[PDB]
Amino acid sequence: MKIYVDGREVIINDNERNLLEALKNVGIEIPNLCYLSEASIYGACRMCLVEINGQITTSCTLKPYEGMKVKTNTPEIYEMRRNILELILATHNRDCTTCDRNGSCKLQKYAEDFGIRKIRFEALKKEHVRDESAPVVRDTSKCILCGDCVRVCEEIQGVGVIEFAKRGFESVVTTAFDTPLIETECVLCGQCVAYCPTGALSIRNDIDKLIEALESDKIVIGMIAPAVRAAIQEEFGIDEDVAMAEKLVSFLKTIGFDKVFDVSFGADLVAYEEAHEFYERLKKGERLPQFTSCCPAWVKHAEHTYPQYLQNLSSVKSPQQALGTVIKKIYARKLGVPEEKIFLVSFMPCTAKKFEAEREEHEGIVDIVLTTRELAQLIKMSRIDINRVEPQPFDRPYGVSSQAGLGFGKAGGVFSCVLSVLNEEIGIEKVDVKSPEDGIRVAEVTLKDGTSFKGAVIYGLGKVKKFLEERKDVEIIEVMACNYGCVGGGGQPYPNDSRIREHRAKVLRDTMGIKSLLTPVENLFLMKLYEEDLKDEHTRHEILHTTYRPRRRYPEKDVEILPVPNGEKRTVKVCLGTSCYTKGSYEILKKLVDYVKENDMEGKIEVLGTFCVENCGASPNVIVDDKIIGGATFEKVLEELS
Amino acid sequence: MKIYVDGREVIINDNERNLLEALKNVGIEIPNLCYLSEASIYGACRMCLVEINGQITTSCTLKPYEGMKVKTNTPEIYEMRRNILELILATHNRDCTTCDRNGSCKLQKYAEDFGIRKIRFEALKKEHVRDESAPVVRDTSKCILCGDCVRVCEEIQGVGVIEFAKRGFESVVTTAFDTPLIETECVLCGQCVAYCPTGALSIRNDIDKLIEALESDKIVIGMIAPAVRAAIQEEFGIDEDVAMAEKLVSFLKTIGFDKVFDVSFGADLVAYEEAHEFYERLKKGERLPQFTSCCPAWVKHAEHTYPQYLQNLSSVKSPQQALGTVIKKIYARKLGVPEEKIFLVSFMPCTAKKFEAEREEHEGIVDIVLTTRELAQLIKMSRIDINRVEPQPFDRPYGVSSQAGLGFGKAGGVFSCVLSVLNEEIGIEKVDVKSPEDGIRVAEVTLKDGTSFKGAVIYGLGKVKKFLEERKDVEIIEVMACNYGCVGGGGQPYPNDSRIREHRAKVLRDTMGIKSLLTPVENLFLMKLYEEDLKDEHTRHEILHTTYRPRRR
Amino acid sequence: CGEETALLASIEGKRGMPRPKPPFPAQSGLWGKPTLINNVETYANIPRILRDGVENYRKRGTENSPGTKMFSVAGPLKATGIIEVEFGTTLRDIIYNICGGFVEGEEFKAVQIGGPSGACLSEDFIDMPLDYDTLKKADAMVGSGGIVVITKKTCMVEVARFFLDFTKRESCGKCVPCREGTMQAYNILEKFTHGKATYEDLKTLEHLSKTIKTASLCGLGKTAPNPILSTLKLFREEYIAHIEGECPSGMCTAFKKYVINPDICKGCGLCARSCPQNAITGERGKPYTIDQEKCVKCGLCASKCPFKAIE
Numbered sequence A: 001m002k003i004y005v006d007g008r009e010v011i012i013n014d015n016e017r018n019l020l021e022a023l024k025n026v027g028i029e030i031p032n033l034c035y036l037s038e039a040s041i042y043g044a045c046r047m048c049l050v051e052i053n054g055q056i057t058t059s060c061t062l063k064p065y066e067g068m069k070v071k072t073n074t075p076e077i078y079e080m081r082r083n084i085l086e087l088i089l090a091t092h093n094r095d096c097t098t099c100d101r102n103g104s105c106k107l108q109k110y111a112e113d114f115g116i117r118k119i120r121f122e123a124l125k126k127e128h129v130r131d132e133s134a135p136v137v138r139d140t141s142k143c144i145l146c147g148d149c150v151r152v153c154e155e156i157q158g159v160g161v162i163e164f165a166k167r168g169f170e171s172v173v174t175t176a177f178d179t180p181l182i183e184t185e186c187v188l189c190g191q192c193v194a195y196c197p198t199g200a201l202s203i204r205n206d207i208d209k210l211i212e213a214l215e216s217d218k219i220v221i222g223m224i225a226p227a228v229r230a231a232i233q234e235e236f237g238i239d240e241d242v243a244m245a246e247k248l249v250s251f252l253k254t255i256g257f258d259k260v261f262d263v264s265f266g267a268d269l270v271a272y273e274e275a276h277e278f279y280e281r282l283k284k285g286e287r288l289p290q291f292t293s294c295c296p297a298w299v300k301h302a303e304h305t306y307p308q309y310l311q312n313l314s315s316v317k318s319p320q321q322a323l324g325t326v327i328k329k330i331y332a333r334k335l336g337v338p339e340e341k342i343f344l345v346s347f348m349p350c351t352a353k354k355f356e357a358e359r360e361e362h363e364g365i366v367d368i369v370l371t372t373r374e375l376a377q378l379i380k381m382s383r384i385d386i387n388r389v390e391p392q393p394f395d396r397p398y399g400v401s402s403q404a405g406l407g408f409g410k411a412g413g414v415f416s417c418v419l420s421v422l423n424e425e426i427g428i429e430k431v432d433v434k435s436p437e438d439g440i441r442v443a444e445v446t447l448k449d450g451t452s453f454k455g456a457v458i459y460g461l462g463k464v465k466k467f468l469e470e471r472k473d474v475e476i477i478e479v480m481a482c483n484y485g486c487v488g489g490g491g492q493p494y495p496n497d498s499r500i501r502e503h504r505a506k507v508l509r510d511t512m513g514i515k516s517l518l519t520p521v522e523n524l525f526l527m528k529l530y531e532e533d534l535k536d537e538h539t540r541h542e543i544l545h546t547t548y549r550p551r552r553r554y555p556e557k558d559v560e561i562l563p564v565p566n567g568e569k570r571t572v573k574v575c576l577g578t579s580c581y582t583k584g585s586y587e588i589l590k591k592l593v594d595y596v597k598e599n600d601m602e603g604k605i606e607v608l609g610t611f612c613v614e615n616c617g618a619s620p621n622v623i624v625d626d627k628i629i630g631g632a633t634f635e636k637v638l639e640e641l642s
Numbered sequence B: 001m002k003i004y005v006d007g008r009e010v011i012i013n014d015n016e017r018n019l020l021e022a023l024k025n026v027g028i029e030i031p032n033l034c035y036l037s038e039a040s041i042y043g044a045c046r047m048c049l050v051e052i053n054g055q056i057t058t059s060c061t062l063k064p065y066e067g068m069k070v071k072t073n074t075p076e077i078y079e080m081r082r083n084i085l086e087l088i089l090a091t092h093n094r095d096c097t098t099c100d101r102n103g104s105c106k107l108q109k110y111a112e113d114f115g116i117r118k119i120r121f122e123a124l125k126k127e128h129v130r131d132e133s134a135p136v137v138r139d140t141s142k143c144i145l146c147g148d149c150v151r152v153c154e155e156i157q158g159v160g161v162i163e164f165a166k167r168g169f170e171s172v173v174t175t176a177f178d179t180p181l182i183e184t185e186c187v188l189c190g191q192c193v194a195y196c197p198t199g200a201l202s203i204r205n206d207i208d209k210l211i212e213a214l215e216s217d218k219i220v221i222g223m224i225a226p227a228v229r230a231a232i233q234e235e236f237g238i239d240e241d242v243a244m245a246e247k248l249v250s251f252l253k254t255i256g257f258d259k260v261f262d263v264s265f266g267a268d269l270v271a272y273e274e275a276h277e278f279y280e281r282l283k284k285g286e287r288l289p290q291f292t293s294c295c296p297a298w299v300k301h302a303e304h305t306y307p308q309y310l311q312n313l314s315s316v317k318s319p320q321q322a323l324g325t326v327i328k329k330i331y332a333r334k335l336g337v338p339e340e341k342i343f344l345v346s347f348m349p350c351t352a353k354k355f356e357a358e359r360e361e362h363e364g365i366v367d368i369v370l371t372t373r374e375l376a377q378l379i380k381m382s383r384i385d386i387n388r389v390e391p392q393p394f395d396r397p398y399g400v401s402s403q404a405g406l407g408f409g410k411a412g413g414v415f416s417c418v419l420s421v422l423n424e425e426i427g428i429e430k431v432d433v434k435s436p437e438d439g440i441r442v443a444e445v446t447l448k449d450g451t452s453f454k455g456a457v458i459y460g461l462g463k464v465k466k467f468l469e470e471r472k473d474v475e476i477i478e479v480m481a482c483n484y485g486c487v488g489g490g491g492q493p494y495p496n497d498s499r500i501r502e503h504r505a506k507v508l509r510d511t512m513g514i515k516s517l518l519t520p521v522e523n524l525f526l527m528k529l530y531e532e533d534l535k536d537e538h539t540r541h542e543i544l545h546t547t548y549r550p551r552r553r
Numbered sequence C: 001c002g003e004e005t006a007l008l009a010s011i012e013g014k015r016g017m018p019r020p021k022p023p024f025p026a027q028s029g030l031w032g033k034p035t036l037i038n039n040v041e042t043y044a045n046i047p048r049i050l051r052d053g054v055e056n057y058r059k060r061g062t063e064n065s066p067g068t069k070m071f072s073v074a075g076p077l078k079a080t081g082i083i084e085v086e087f088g089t090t091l092r093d094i095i096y097n098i099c100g101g102f103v104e105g106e107e108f109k110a111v112q113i114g115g116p117s118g119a120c121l122s123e124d125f126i127d128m129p130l131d132y133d134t135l136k137k138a139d140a141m142v143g144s145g146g147i148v149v150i151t152k153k154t155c156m157v158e159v160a161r162f163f164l165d166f167t168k169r170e171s172c173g174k175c176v177p178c179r180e181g182t183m184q185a186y187n188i189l190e191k192f193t194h195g196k197a198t199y200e201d202l203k204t205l206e207h208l209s210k211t212i213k214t215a216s217l218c219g220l221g222k223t224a225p226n227p228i229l230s231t232l233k234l235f236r237e238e239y240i241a242h243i244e245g246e247c248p249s250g251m252c253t254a255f256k257k258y259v260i261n262p263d264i265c266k267g268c269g270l271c272a273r274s275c276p277q278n279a280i281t282g283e284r285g286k287p288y289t290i291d292q293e294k295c296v297k298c299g300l301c302a303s304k305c306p307f308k309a310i311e
């Protein structure tokens, strides 16, 4: 097609959806704040205005046609674009120094390019939400309401815990009733953070704890995730680099780490244990299908959504927790130092690992979890060229791992490791792998003896629902909450789209290829660990196994009138439903409020409002000390309060 | 010199002032906030801490010796560095969106790198000073008190109007008695802005006025300074284009400029007039030495400091004002349009040109002045790939110029063009250029018929005082406030250090090399202008000559 | 201006700004010429040594701190003024024999030996000979010669706050650590003296003190946190008492006063539960006013207030 852009002949393309994308394909860029990630849509920024036939319109919603005269730059368009940008910046929390998107923010770059040096509009105040109760931190004062996180959570992750609320100037992306993210069904996959174009969604930074620990007298022990080494090179803007982990070891030892281990060893150990457990389940044909528990986001999702499948989850804990428990409970004894003296630092690509390390069943094992970005910040602080750092190997005895263990970093890693363990223990005649969908792979496996099973690998939460609803012919299911596995984790370097994730997977595959030993049993150190420390089943169960509990919201959220923050009280609740309101309840509430106004000097009495208690038809109801009265009134509640 | 850094072999140069610079030269970097510009000194940030013989010390004040072992990164040093950075950030005005250093701020980059996502140090309240009276804008809430601006103003520019006041937490870099800059002896050269590492010293941005004018029904007319085309390429991070001026013309036309002219035409005009008047002064011998008046910063400095030399200043206005006057007083008439219908936009490399356009003498001629950075911002707004823009020439009749006219962009341009004009009218026998020191050049010039005279080229304000006191035998003195001339102007892209300015001068020389016209006399449009509109002496004075008055508080 | 480089700068008519010391003032001081800088007492000593002999001059003092030292002793004591004591004299001797003990109603709690750049001493260090070398291995020093006794009726947190206020005022503002950290530490101490502190604030104060001590350009900043470090090491208990209650000595609460902040008071109960004098008599649901007529200033209200508003 031939079009005229600013008076010059331009050939865009044969078939195109809109003018903006066609021109971008040509190489002509129109400023806009809509295309911000892979989960972006068009129409909200309104900054892509072009002029055609006299009238101005958005180029993202304009279907191109043959020989169309379009002016992309006119004084009116400059005025409108600068006005829109100033409108965005007027109510934006402009503190970039402490922002997590500092230096990689499109809004910041536009503010620089557009020469905005003063706010012509008023920085009006909003009812902003600041949620810091979870490793995923929400700050709606930096939100531009692009809606990418909502689409990511709903369409891509299948959880839908964050949505647009209210309207107009008060429009806000938040959880229901402004509930803290830690208390919602959020699985903390961190994908919303990975797609957020501003600092509104960010990861909780815990570098201060690490620095104060290094400065102390405790023995600091580090362990690096397999997928951290496959993506850290992006933060420094250098090419892929095998041996990244060993120069990371060198740097960590330089900044004061006493020991540095490889979480791939924990991955090998977990794969061995889970292979044996799955074989027992197969021979018994019970607790099937089996689910891998290596992804904490998927584990929490199952606890929230599949309480009936919690018995199907693998008892084996994740590589991080397995290796950390092994360290704290065995390595400490071997070194003759109390467990309190060891400070354990985990370098992960995942935000859900921060939650996992703080779980009650894992209390005190992993002291702090630092994401890939925090490790990159640690490196950048020192200002040493990591590319020039001479690599040195991991520390013994948890430094070596098999290729299968390092494969954990991407989707299908744990399933392949389990398959290798089983093959070594009992050969595998053949494996047939099918691809029903993009992120779902099903493998049919036949063992040498003759017993066969089916295994499925599912990466990307939200695809699990349909597969579990329609497919019931599998015995083991691998679930990874993030697309492409951990190479696309929440804590990975930004941007974190599909192309970079595929490149990270390629880098991790290249790193795997240069590993000599191929299966966990070939790992001599792991077999020595089993023979010396995990010889018996009781110690092995207490070290490598965990239990899961169902999750269900416990919302009381009764109407507060005269609350008492704490201390023994009476907690009188007055029903505010229509049936109860139809006679008395509101009058009774007024009388009780005035009573505690004249009496009840201290917080002995707590006057609350509550919704229908499913006792209608029995006169107004007044709950006292969580007790039903019926036919309640001021005197009938006073007598009980006595 | 064999030293060990973090337990390895490092070979540093034998004679180094401090370990920090030795490590820098070899390749090891240590975070710090002292080396920020050319006028920087060490000892203030205290962020270059290293471990020597078990004791922590700053590496900028440490003399390297043989066999020394230094731990460049330790947990204690980590904590100290982040504490210092957070101390800086706690009181800093952390609004980068509306800051002129956004994207090129070292403090912003360190805050990004150090992972400072919160401040446990409460934001104490400081009696901050914000100034908007002058084209050079002051904002002490972004100041890190590095002192670079003070050294630039005193040691380099020789004015010393900004200094450290008060002490302790209330330490501030300000003018005497917090006086607004426009009321002080500041010459508005903008060199302090060119050196400031933060947004504390910025240039007043006037893009909103330009967009309002372009939206209006007025005939918007633009003119580009010769030195703007030699530096605008740096804002886009691409190679210098010898045809960048034509691309800028095309882009400005795309955004609604009726006409785009070359200020080099005004430079040719000014050089012609100035050479004529200087030769007349030589003949009679009155009002010598003659001083060029093409630099508004130098003009203001003379008004404040040398009230006795105001008559010695050349009466010809600067190329910007001369060309703007010609436009609004002749071109508007030949277009059959009222003067108030025209919006004259000047794209300059200088912050003192903004002050000059607003002077009472030239009020209402140049409607607005924009710097190279502001033109670069205009280009970045549209996202147009300037490298791929098809160049077109400047609009007639003020679109062409000679090598000498375009030479104004660098120091020694007006003097060279005056010599060109003289040699064209009265031939020149020989020129004996001398270089007493780095920023001064004295040349003996002998004419075909008559005696000889010495002309001096001084770039960088501050050298003028010593030169004028010591020397009393030169007939013409050319003064540029900024080092290297207008290529190092305060309105130029950041950062602009000596190497950057030399590169810009080289680019300008290459641009001059491709011009066919060599002298202002060859310019046919210029001669047409003289023989059509400026025929009479009275109109020539009333269109090209200005006056100066003393400045005092 | 007591700093050597700052002194030389101020003698030249400039701002008394200290500078790093590669060129020590002895090799190049005023206008780059070699300069000798000494205290008044040293110059006074010189002629005394010349008049006497080396052994005659060493007959009084210590093998490493020969001679005498002149002190100005202040604080509540029966006799306060300029004293001259041989090196090696203990602080008990100075405070009880040469100053005649304390005035009635005053006991001994601590003593400052070098002002802001000095150190805080307790009853464990009172009996120690005053020697240049002895005090260095004691977290102390003889100091310039100023001695002020601290009684049991003064709060040590207040002492540290006062010294930090002075140092914050006197900082020349050249280097980031002293200029910014002294203000931040003073703000933390100001919060401490107003019952707004927390354990996190104490940790911040400690780490910031270490940073200021290590990173400051000159001696003023290096010794700026000396009162903080000494007072912490010797009265951590007093610091805690300020964190989880009121001032043990009453100095902070003596002339201060408790006021309910209605901006963040939703009129809950409590308050009266512990208040022995029942100085609340508030209106339920609305902010609870605190009756100051009968407020003994016990500080129990702040100790337990879920919405901390006891200002």
Ligand SMILES: Cc1cc2nc3c(=O)[nH]c(=O)nc-3n(C[C@H](O)[C@H](O)[C@H](O)COP(=O)(O)O)c2cc1C
Pocket (backbone or CB within 6 Å): C001, C002, C003, C004, C037, C038, C039, C040, C042, C218, C219, C220
């Ligand atoms: C903040 C500060 C204040 C000082 N004040 C004085 C002072 O008032 N008198 C003095 O003699 N030395 C003072 N000094 C000590 C000097 O810096 C330096 O040590 C002096 O030259 C030592 O002289 P001396 O050997 O005679 O004792 C001060 C040091 C600092 C860091």
Ligand code: SF4
Pocket (backbone or CB within 6 Å): A092, A093, A094, A095, A096, A099, A100, A101, A102, A103, A105, A106, A107, A108, A142, A197, A198, A199, A200, B096, B097
């Ligand atoms: S999102 Fe962060 S970096 Fe971007 S403009 Fe807002 S505060 Fe600045």
Ligand code: SF4
Pocket (backbone or CB within 6 Å): A136, A152, A153, A157, A159, A160, A161, A162, A185, A186, A187, A188, A189, A190, A191, A192, A193
């Ligand atoms: S972390 Fe994952 S589950 Fe939680 S809100 Fe973000 S996208 Fe949704």
Ligand code: SF4
Pocket (backbone or CB within 6 Å): A142, A143, A144, A145, A146, A147, A148, A149, A150, A173, A192, A195, A196, A197, A198, A200, A201
């Ligand atoms: S939180 Fe981030 S991704 Fe979600 S709407 Fe706001 S800016 Fe967009």
Ligand code: SF4
Pocket (backbone or CB within 6 Å): A188, A189, A294, A295, A296, A297, A298, A349, A350, A351, A352, A353, A480, A481, A482, A485, A486, A487, A488, A489, A490
């Ligand atoms: S797939 Fe990997 S990165 Fe993503 S939540 Fe699970 S463990 Fe974390």
Ligand code: SF4
Pocket (backbone or CB within 6 Å): A096, A097, B092, B093, B094, B095, B096, B099, B100, B101, B102, B103, B105, B106, B107, B108, B142, B197, B198, B199, B200
């Ligand atoms: S100087 Fe400007 S860009 Fe740099 S940190 Fe301060 S506000 Fe941000």
Ligand code: SF4
Pocket (backbone or CB within 6 Å): B136, B152, B153, B157, B159, B160, B161, B162, B185, B186, B187, B188, B189, B190, B191, B192, B193
């Ligand atoms: S513009 Fe020039 S004269 Fe004015 S304060 Fe800055 S450096 Fe000094």
Ligand code: SF4
Pocket (backbone or CB within 6 Å): B142, B143, B144, B145, B146, B147, B148, B149, B150, B173, B195, B196, B197, B198, B200, B201
């Ligand atoms: S105004 Fe700029 S150059 Fe001057 S001291 Fe402050 S930060 Fe440094």
Ligand code: SF4
Pocket (backbone or CB within 6 Å): B188, B189, B294, B295, B296, B297, B298, B349, B350, B351, B352, B353, B480, B481, B482, B485, B486, B487, B488, B489, B490
């Ligand atoms: S030398 Fe040029 S850039 Fe510098 S002040 Fe003078 S006219 Fe402006």
Ligand code: SF4
Pocket (backbone or CB within 6 Å): C018, C170, C171, C172, C173, C174, C175, C176, C178, C179, C216, C217, C218, C219, C220, C221, C222
């Ligand atoms: S430590 Fe304090 S007094 Fe000494 S140079 Fe630094 S700011 Fe000035």
Ligand code: SF4
Pocket (backbone or CB within 6 Å): C260, C264, C265, C266, C267, C268, C269, C270, C271, C287, C288, C304, C305, C306, C307, C308, C309, C310
């Ligand atoms: S306890 Fe606190 S919130 Fe409750 S009434 Fe007293 S001051 Fe107010």
Ligand code: SF4
Pocket (backbone or CB within 6 Å): C258, C274, C275, C276, C277, C278, C279, C280, C290, C291, C294, C295, C296, C297, C298, C299, C300, C301, C302
């Ligand atoms: S400080 Fe003590 S006496 Fe005073 S009002 Fe509070 S509880 Fe009562």
Ligand code: FES
Pocket (backbone or CB within 6 Å): A020, A032, A033, A034, A035, A042, A043, A044, A045, A046, A047, A048, A058, A059, A060, A061
């Ligand atoms: S690209 Fe955002 S509305 Fe068109």
Ligand code: FES
Pocket (backbone or CB within 6 Å): A575, A576, A577, A578, A579, A580, A581, A611, A612, A613, A614, A615, A616, A621
């Ligand atoms: S309305 Fe009160 S019980 Fe239902």
Ligand code: FES
Pocket (backbone or CB within 6 Å): B020, B032, B033, B034, B035, B042, B043, B044, B045, B046, B047, B048, B058, B059, B060, B061
């Ligand atoms: S580099 Fe700034 S004090 Fe050393």
Ligand SMILES: [Zn+2]
Pocket (backbone or CB within 6 Å): C155, C156, C157, C158, C193, C242, C246, C247, C248, C249, C250, C251, C252, C253
């Ligand atoms: Zn106290």
